[PDB]
């Protein structure tokens, strides 16, 4: 019906056009007959009739009298819904400032009039005057005055002169301002200055003015004169159970404003004195400022008690306004809620549902089926039938169930597997039954969880719930290609009991003709469940082109494996059930079934697995008893030896032999060793426990201990929990974060005394407080991510470009952490991959890399693929298909229309519940390989090693294949025992250096001369006690004397004959500059060495780390970089902070940067750095990475760091989601050179708009424009959108709506939130087909 919403300021003509009548009196009702006042707030002659088509005085009660107003009382007889629509106005008797345009920060009046906000408050709140059109006087246009200043200005200027107070002066200023002269003079003063803060202030003011003249507004519309009131049905007067009426706060607010206005009209009628009308206008201003936004004043006015009133801005803002409360999340009919329970007999496309909830949800359906078959005549008969509950309504209900899906929901809906569809099955009871395989996907146990059910009414919703949301379609998670139907606990205990083997049981070694008589043996009881047996089996290998080949043979297996083989479908081989079948094996069993046969055998096979698991877990009877936890008999002796060793260490310490920290670390090391010895003793004692005969002699085997099978199958627990149930439970923590030297020597089978339990309670309350605050941080992070995303639907088919990132398998320096196959899976290449042999097109450049191509890359050993990431895609307003990749929940490529921002932000923020909240010696290579240097400038010393004159040398370990498998970072001035491409041995030290000293190593040799070194100004002779040291020490920077202030030392290396040895390549000598804290080692008149030290220069992870990445905080001590290439030198003598000068070779040098003091430099004078180099140390800043290296560099940095967090905690997330959140981060850009474009210079605009700006200029004959990209945080790149409904449904609504009001910012639709608010179709797939139709319509 309508496209884009428009917003603007409110003219007084517009407000009188809205309003129907004037409101004058404060009285609302009459309380005897509750018909309202003549006009009042609630009304009849202004807002409408009270009831349906009835007059007020009792004259017209019929549609035949419709339309004419009453002659007595004037009531336009129309529906009472009209009192929801009509509005009214209040004629103020004095103008009044609008508080959203006064204290919004930035103040719109405060930077339109170019005036301090304090002085504008003093003008508006009636304690000062201000000049308006002064003339040829001794006063300025913006001078503020007081009473005596105005008296003096009148007694000097009793002639033409003007200075007023209140809102009248501000309105006269805003009326007597011509915007054209202001725009011209401000462009003049932009062109005629050089000051940066002036340029910032002037560009804000010129943007306000040139966007204000473009709008049709007027600056004196910011001052109210005619104020609107809200319609009475939106501020209703509720009847409490009692005498009076309960009212909302707005009636009190409007009543106070109307009373104050009437008193001001009385005072201007009766010609009041000036101080009294000043106080009266001040009270009217404070009343209107209390009504429009309460709380921005001082003591906010209160109604009856210690609570402030709730005003109009409070009825929009916050967690309980109308955006986050009534328009995003609505309350819904046809729904319900109860408690869930299990019911294992279901098939996983259906759920239980009570009969009472079914009959209460499907009342109109049962009505429509009863008055169609003819069993009831009308709606009253149908209502009495379904209330009396005759026998026919259960037949009718079993007919209306049959194929009608419902939607089950759990309350903390994190990710998209939290709303699913089910067919109902009727249950007598009051609890929703729920299939057990789905509960891991819900992450819902049965300790009292409540779930809600919703009903799809219409026909398209039933089809969406069957085709997209049905429980048998969501068997792959959208975060990663892993199943979500993992069999959880009873079924894996049952299968692990069913396929095992003891060394002897009933029916040993007899031969069997098939799995059928194996089951006929076990049901009768002649043969035990797990006892090995030769059977004849028949398996189908589908090696033909889709045709099933039958082979058959005799295998040597157990009985339980054969009975399990009567369930496996045709295509799978037999070697998938010949193992022990823990939890990992049954998960990969279902995965291989899904890879080979498809979907329907996998679903029906999951159902048969769960049935046979519950059945044979019931047949087992795996109990747990106090005798099933075997304490070792070495545990006592290991504890006695550990106590003997701490007694020996304490007897060393009690006579003055070791320190405190030495004893502490000694004690914690020997207790950790005793802990691991006890753990190995108990694990051996459990795992090889049972020894039983087979034909005579004994034999060991794996044990049938209860807790051992419940830990080995993987049903519940790990090795650490059975360690805490049998061996000692380690060393518990403390609230300092330290660790107590006396461990908890007991375990849960035995007792605990008081102190050990208390020490355990420390860590327990720590973990509980962590989870309890972790939930709120997880929810807020998911909200910010899904509101910076979801402007983004897959909306093309191919961008037809070539850009993209370079994927490599990752190496930290330990073992390889993520290989190439997990990263370059299912994502279309950009360049065709060069075969490393000779020039072959190995893959074409537009092929979706499925698993076969990934294995071919694994064959031919390719280490880097230039793949098409999202962040370099070239799609207007969206993301094309062949830059995204595979869907990861389906098999094929992404479809044109599926929203990916929402699934991306949900898969990133969903594992936030699993994230915690509270050296430098040498290089020790691991495996034998080959050496590759990277970015080194080195020289061979006299000793035969290799020394390094560069600063970022990387040492990569080539293997025998041609790929890198280890990498490190060698600092400046180390020792390399290798060279370029030499061979190593496993475990060899290949590089070694010093952690303390920054070395001052050399390159040439010969005689050494000192220049500009003074014993007294630059250096001194520091000698330590009993000659602990005897060498020259260079003094530091600021502490030297001013007479030697400008002087800097230089150690000059000359030849054997005193002539200057130059740097090889240049004609400058090889002198070295000594910085502060230098100690002269090799002295004056010394022939020196190559690589020679000339001085001695000594020196938070978790969910907030993910927040600090995606928000792009700068860290508290950042790492500075070099903004331009060139040689580096020092200037200013550190008056607080020390200057740094960087000078290029062939370009200009207008660069300088003042380093803090207080930050150590990893740079000498001679390190001629490149841009992208560090100057100090510290964490590296994302803004610096973007404005120096590039967009691909910053997106690699973000994906690697947040993957380090989510992968250290053990969670898989594919990189598509992090890359698309990065794309929504770095959307805005700034303009540098306008050229022939339509933008001002120092201006910000979105990248899409500037990209299709100079795409029409570039194909034509003009000059383009230059953009510099600008990375924003997610709470800044969501408040800066080409739309205000998104930015108002997000955080603070006040500044968003004030900027929209002063700009006239027209909001087009076609996001997702901008359609969810307005109540139409989303432009995701189904509605996206509809919007394609609508866009080709217009």
């Amino acid at each position: 019906e309508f496209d884009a919403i428009k917003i603007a300021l409110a003219s007084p003509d517009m407000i009188r056009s809205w309003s129907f009548g004037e409101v004058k009196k404060p009285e609302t009702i009459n309380y005897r007959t509750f018909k309202p006042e003549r006009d009042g707030l609630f009304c009849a002659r202004i807002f409408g009739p009270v009831k349906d088509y009835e007059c007020l005085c009792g004259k017209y009660k019929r549609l035949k009298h419709r339309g004419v107003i009453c002659e007595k009382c004037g009531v336009e007889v129309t529906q009472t819904k009209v009192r929801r629509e009509r509005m009214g106005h209040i004629e103020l008797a004095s103008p009044t400032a609008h508080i959203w345009f006064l204290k919004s920060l930035p103040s719109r009046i405060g930077l339109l009039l170019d005036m301090p906000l304090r002085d504008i408050e003093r003008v508006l709140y009636f304690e000062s005057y201000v000049v308006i059109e002064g003339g040829m006087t001794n006063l300025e246009r913006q001078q503020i005055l007081t009473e005596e200043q105005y008296l003096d200005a009148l007694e000097e200027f009793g002639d033409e002169f003007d200075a007023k107070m209140g809102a009248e002066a501000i309105q006269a200023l805003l009326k007597s301002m011509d915007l054209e002269q202001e725009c011209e003079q401000l462009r003049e003063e932009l062109n005629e200055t050089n000051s940066e803060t002036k340029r910032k202030k002037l560009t804000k003011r010129i943007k306000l003015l040139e966007a204000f003249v473009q709008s049709g507004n007027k600056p004196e519309w910011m001052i109210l004169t005619v104020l609107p009131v809200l319609p009475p049905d939106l501020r209703p007067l509720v009847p409490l159970d009692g005498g009076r009426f309960a009212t909302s706060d707005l009636n009190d607010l409007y009543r106070r404003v109307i009373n104050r206005n009437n008193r001001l009209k009385r005072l201007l009628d009766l010609a009041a004195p000036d101080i009294i009308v000043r106080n009266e206008k001040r009270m009217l201003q404070e009343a209107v400022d209390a009504l429009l936004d309460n709380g921005r004043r001082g003591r906010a006015i209160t109604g009856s008690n210690k609570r402030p009133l709730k005003s109009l801005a409070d009825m929009i803002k916050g967690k309980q306004g109308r955006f986050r409360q009534n328009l995003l999340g609505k309350r819904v009919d046809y729904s319900g809620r109860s408690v869930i329970t299990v019911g294992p007999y279901l098939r996983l496309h259906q759920c239980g549902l009570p009969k009472k909830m079914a009959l209460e949800l499907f009342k109109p359906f049962i009505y429509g089926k009863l008055e169609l078959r003819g069993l009831a005549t009308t709606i009253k008969a149908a209502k009495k039938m379904v209330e009396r509950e005759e026998a026919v309504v259960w037949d009718i209900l079993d007919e209306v169930i049959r194929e009608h899906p419902v939607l089950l929901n759990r309350a903390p809906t994190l990710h998209r597997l939290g709303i699913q569809a089910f067919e109902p099955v009727l249950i007598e009871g009051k609890a929703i039954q729920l299939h057990p395989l789905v509960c891991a996907a819900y992450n819902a146990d049965f300790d009292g969880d409540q779930m809600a059910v919703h009903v799809p009414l219409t026909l398209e919703a039933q089809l969406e719930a069957r085709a997209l949301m049905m429980s048998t379609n969501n068997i792959l998670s959208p975060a990663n290609g892993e199943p979500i139907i993992v069999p959880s606990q009873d079924v894996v205990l049952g299968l692990y009991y069913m396929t095992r083997d003891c060394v002897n049981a009933k029916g040993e070694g007899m031969v069997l003709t098939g799995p059928k008589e194996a089951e006929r043996l076990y049901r009768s009881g002649l043969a035990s469940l797990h006892a090995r047996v030769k059977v004849r089996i028949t398996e189908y290998e589908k090696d033909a082109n889709g045709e099933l080949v039958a082979k058959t043979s005799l295998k040597d297996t157990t009985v339980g494996r054969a009975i399990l083989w009567m369930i496996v479908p045709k295509g799978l081989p037999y070697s998938i059930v010949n193992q022990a079948l823990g939890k990992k094996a049954i998960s990969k069993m279902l995965n291989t079934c899904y890879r080979i046969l498809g979907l329907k055998p996998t679903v029906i096979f999951a159902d048969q697995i769960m049935y046979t698991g519950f059945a044979y877990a019931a047949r087992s009877g795996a109990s747990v008893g106090i005798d099933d936890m075997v304490i070792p008999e070495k545990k006592h002796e290991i504890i006695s030896e550990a106590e003997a060793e701490v007694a020996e260490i304490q007897e060393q310490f009690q006579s003055g032999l070791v320190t405190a920290g030495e004893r502490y670390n000694k004690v914690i090391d020997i207790w950790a060793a005793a802990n691991d010895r006890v753990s190995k003793a108990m694990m051996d004692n459990l795992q090889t426990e049972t020894v039983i005969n087979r034909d005579g002699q004994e034999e060991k085997q794996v044990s049938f201990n209860s807790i051992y099978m419940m830990a080995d199958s993987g049903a519940r627990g790990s090795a650490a929990q059975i360690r805490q149930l049998a061996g000692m439970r380690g060393l518990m923590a403390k609230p300092d974060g330290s660790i107590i030297e006396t461990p908890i020597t007991a375990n849960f089978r035995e007792g605990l005394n008081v102190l050990q339990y208390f020490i355990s309670t420390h860590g327990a309350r720590k973990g509980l407080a962590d989870t309890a605050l972790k939930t709120a941080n997880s929810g807020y992070l998911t909200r910010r991510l899904v509101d910076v995303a979801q402007d983004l639907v897959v909306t093309e088919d191919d961008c037809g470009t070539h850009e993209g990132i370079m994927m490599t398998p990752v190496i930290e320096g330990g073992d390889v952490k993520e290989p190439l196959r997990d990263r370059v899976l299912g994502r279309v290449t950009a360049e065709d991959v060069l075969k490393p042999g000779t020039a072959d097109i190995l893959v074409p450049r537009n092929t979706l890399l499925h698993e076969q191509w990934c294995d071919l890359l694994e064959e031919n050993s390719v280490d880097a693929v230039k793949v098409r990431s999202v962040v370099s895609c070239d799609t207007d307003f969206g993301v094309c298909a062949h830059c995204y990749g595979r869907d990861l929940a389906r098999g094929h490529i992404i479809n044109k229309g599926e929203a990916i921002g929402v699934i991306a932000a949900q898969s990133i923020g969903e594992p936030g519940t699993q994230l915690t909240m509270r050296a430098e010696s040498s290089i020790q290579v691991k495996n034998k390989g080959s050496i590759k240097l990277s970015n080194v400038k080195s020289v061979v010393n006299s000793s035969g090693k290799l020394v390094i004159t560069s600063r970022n040398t990387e040492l990569k370990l080539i293997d025998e294949f041609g790929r890198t498998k280890e990498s490190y970072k060698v600092p400046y001035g180390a020792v390399l025992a290798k060279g370029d491409g030499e061979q190593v041995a496993g475990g060899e030290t290949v590089a070694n250096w010093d952690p303390h000293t920054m070395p001052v190593i050399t390159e040439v040799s010969g005689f050494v001369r000192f220049t500009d070194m003074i014993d007294g100004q630059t250096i001194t002779r520091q000698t330590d006690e009993l000659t602990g040291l005897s060498s020259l020490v260079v003094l530091d920077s600021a502490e030297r004397t001013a007479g030697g202030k400008d002087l800097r030392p230089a150690l000059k290396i000359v030849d054997a004959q005193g002539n200057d040895v130059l740097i090889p390549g240049t004609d400058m000598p090889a002198q070295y500059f000594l910085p502060g804290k230098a100690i002269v080692q090799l002295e004056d008149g010394v022939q020196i060495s190559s690589g020679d030290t000339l001085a001695r220069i000594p020196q938070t992870g978790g969910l907030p780390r993910v927040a600090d990445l995606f928000e792009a905080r700068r860290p508290k001590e950042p790492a500075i970089l070099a903004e331009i290439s060139g040689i580096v030198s020092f200037g200013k003598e550190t008056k607080g902070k020390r200057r740094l000068v960087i000078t290029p070779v062939d370009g200009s040098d207008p660069y300088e940067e003042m380093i803090p003091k207080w930050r150590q430099l990893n740079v000498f004078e001679g390190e001629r750095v490149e841009r992208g180099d560090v100057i100090s140390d510290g964490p590296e800043a994302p803004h610096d990475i973007l404005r120096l290296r590039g967009v691909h560099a910053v997106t690699r940095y973000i994906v690697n760091e947040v993957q380090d967090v989510y992968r250290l905690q053990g969670v898989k997330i594919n990189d598509k989601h992090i890359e698309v959140i990065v794309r929504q981060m770095l959307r805005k850009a700034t303009i540098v050179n306008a050229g022939s474009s339509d933008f001002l210079e120092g201006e910000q605009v979105e990248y899409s708009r500037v990209k299709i700006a100079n795409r029409e200029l570039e194909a034509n004959g003009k000059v383009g424009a230059t953009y510099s990209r600008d990375l924003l945080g997610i709470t800044k790149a969501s408040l800066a959108t080409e739309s205000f409904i998104s930015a108002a449904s997000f955080q603070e609504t006040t500044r968003v709506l004030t900027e929209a009001a002063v700009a006239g910012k027209r909001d087009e639709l076609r996001g997702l939130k901008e359609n969810v608010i307005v109540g139409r179709l989303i432009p995701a797939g189904t509605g996206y087909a509809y919007h394609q139709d609508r866009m080709r319509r217009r």
Partner: protein, 98 residues
Amino acid sequence: HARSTGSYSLVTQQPLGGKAQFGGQRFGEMEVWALEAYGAAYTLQEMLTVKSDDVNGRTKMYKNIVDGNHQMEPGMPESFNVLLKEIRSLGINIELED
């Protein structure tokens, strides 16, 4: 607890909350995200348009269900009209362009 069609609220025409008051469930913001994550569009449209607000649309919906024609009409949420009257009751003109 279960609700087919009961009493409605007064200031914004939505279903109530609770059990003692005969009220319906709360289709929250995360559930709106979970239906936007699928390509379900008609389901979300009726979930926050016809089942919850838009008094003309929901009376036509009840008549169509009891006659046997599963068909919805979009209309417009009445609480969005409430939002327009609240923003318009300030000095902020807001309209709907054509």
